[PDB]
């Protein structure tokens, strides 16, 4: 009765060899739990990777429709539903995720209630319905008992640090996570291991440890086939080369862009950094979003205007942005641009202070180079990057 069961029953009467093929793909010892899954409603595999690996290799193009149907039909009190919630969150399938959260909050199993409550906190935080301070308050209010939700509560805040351009807390949060403590759920452990890897990759990218950054991103790319992890992995590798190597940076951004086909949210990340890359290297720029009101997007239009030596038009557009709320990292770039336009040392010092505040050891190079060009002590500038 669940779409995937119907699909597999249909394909099985046409082809008898599919039992053995699905058994090895699902990591099963023998074809028996497969028979059970197809016949007795309610049967769920011991490991959720069983259903994902069957869906991925047999119905590559119907994953979302099939998975959405599987998940909405699951008993919310079970390990399966708990894994489906992780699956949905990891892929950013928000319709699947919000409906599981709704029904997991209400039910009477303590573990599923906990998973519901923590993922809701993560969702409310990504959407700006709450801020870090309420998140932390809600996490403690929960008195979490599982190792997993303890770990996921640390990652939750790391994701917020990452999009608010506040990178200092993140290595500190990372160090509080130990994955071998998660015992029952093998799938959840795998998913987390991969989440951590891109997280780690970002941490190193901001610490300017560029070799380790690419190590962890590649580690993620090698072991996953979930679109979300591919996207951010390639995003990260490309940013790691933004200042060293134009071609390597372009190529990873294009690889990532191909993996993002038909998901406008993921595409936007690449368009933005391709915009920046081409502005920074002063190459022709097919990527600028000229009618976005987003601070990052207006910054790109200004940076382009600077390269076309239109310093007057650039200054007016930049004053318009002083009106707008920006995070510390965005102020970093803001003051860098003010400097290129105005040739004032002051603008560059501010830029360094903001990149220090947000602890972006990567971007700090830009205003530092500029200060060295205007006669500031080079030895001291070296000590600032230490």
Partner 1 sequence: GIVRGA
Instruction: Candidates 83, 239, 278, 359: give the one binding partner 1 (CB under 8 A).
Output: 239
Q: Per rule CB under 8 A, is residue 352 in the interface with partner 1?
A: no
**What is the distance between the alpha carbons of residues 61 and 53, in angstroms, rounded to a whole number?**
13
- Where do we find the tokens 């580690």? 219
Minimum CB–partner distance for residue 87 and partner 1 (Å): 17
Q: Per rule CB under 8 A, is residue 45 in the interface with partner 1?
A: no
Q: What's the 3-state SS for 139-176?
A: HHHCCCCCHHHHHHHHHHHHHHHHHCCCCHHHHHHHHC
Instruction: Candidates 91, 296, 307, 342: give the one binding partner 1 (CB under 8 A).
Output: 296
Minimum CB–partner distance for residue 360 and partner 1 (Å): 8
Least Cα distance to 116 among 134, 136, 133, 138 occurs for 138
CB proximity list for 204: less than 8 A, separation 6 or greater: 210, 212, 213, 216
Minimum CB–partner distance for residue 232 and partner 1 (Å): 5
**What is the distance between the alpha carbons of residues 217 and 46, in angstroms, rounded to a whole number?**
29
Nearer to partner 1, 163 or 282 (CB): 163
**From its phi and psi, is residue 92 left (phi > 0), alpha (psi between -120 and 50) or beta?**
left
Assess contact for 37 and 45: CB atoms under 8 A: yes
Q: Per rule CB under 8 A, is residue 159 in the interface with partner 1?
A: yes
Instruction: Candidates 58, 83, 150, 202: give the one binding partner 1 (CB under 8 A).
Output: 202
Nearer to partner 1, 191 or 273 (CB): 273
Dihedral sign for Cα 65, 68, 70, 72, please: negative
Q: Per rule CB under 8 A, is residue 333 in the interface with partner 1?
A: yes
As given in the structure block, the two tokens for residue 326 are 């920006």
Q: Per rule CB under 8 A, is residue 370 in the interface with partner 1?
A: no
Minimum CB–partner distance for residue 73 and partner 1 (Å): 31
Please give the residue ranges that form the binding site for partner 1 (CB under 8 A).
Answer: 158-159, 162-163, 195, 198-199, 201-202, 205-206, 231-232, 235-236, 239, 242, 269, 272-273, 276, 295-296, 299, 329-330, 332-333, 362-363
């Amino acid at each position: 009765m669940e779409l995937i069961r119907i699909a597999m029953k249909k394909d099985l009467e046409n082809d008898n060899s599919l039992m053995n093929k699905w058994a090895t793909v699902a990591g099963l010892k023998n074809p028996n739990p497969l028979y059970d899954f197809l016949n007795h409603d309610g049967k769920t595999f011991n490991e959720f990777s069983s259903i994902v690996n069957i869906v991925k290799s047999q119905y590559p193009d119907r994953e979302y429709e099939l998975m959405k149907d599987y998940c909405l039909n699951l008993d919310v009190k079970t390990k399966a539903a708990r894994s489906a919630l992780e699956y949905a969150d990891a892929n950013m399938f928000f319709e699947i995720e919000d409906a599981l959260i709704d029904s997991m909050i209400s039910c009477s199993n303590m573990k599923s209630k906990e998973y519901g409550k923590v993922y809701k906190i993560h969702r409310e935080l990504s959407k700006g319905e709450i801020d870090v301070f309420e998140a932390s308050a809600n996490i403690g209010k929960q008195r979490i008992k599982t190792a997993e939700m303890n770990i996921f509560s640390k990652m939750l805040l790391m994701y917020d640090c990452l999009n608010k351009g506040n990178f200092a807390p993140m290595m500190l949060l990372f160090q509080q996570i130990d994955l071998s403590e998660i015992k029952e759920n093998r799938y959840l452990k795998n998913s987390f291991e991969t989440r951590i890897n891109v997280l780690l990759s970002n941490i190193y990218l901001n610490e300017n440890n560029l070799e380790l950054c690419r190590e962890y991103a590649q580690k993620a790319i090698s072991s996953t086939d979930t679109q979300r992890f591919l996207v951010f992995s390639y995003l990260t590798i490309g940013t790691s080369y933004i200042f060293s190597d134009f071609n390597l940076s372009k190529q990873n951004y294009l690889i990532g862009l191909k993996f993002a086909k038909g998901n406008p949210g993921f595409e936007e990340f690449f368009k933005r950094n391709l915009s920046f890359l081409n502005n920074f290297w002063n190459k022709e720029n097919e990527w600028i979003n000229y009618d976005s009101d987003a601070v990052t997007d207006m910054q790109e239009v200004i940076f382009e205007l600077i390269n076309h030596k239109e310093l007057s038009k650039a200054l007016q557009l930049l004053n318009k942005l002083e009106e707008r709320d920006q995070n510390e990292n965005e102020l970093g770039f803001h003051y860098y641009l003010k400097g290129l336009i105005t040739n004032e040392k002051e603008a560059f010092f501010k830029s360094v202070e903001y990149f220090k505040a947000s602890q972006d050891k990567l971007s700090i190079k830009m205003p530092l180079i500029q200060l060295e060009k205007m006669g500031e002590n080079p030895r001291l500038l070296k000590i600032i990057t230490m």
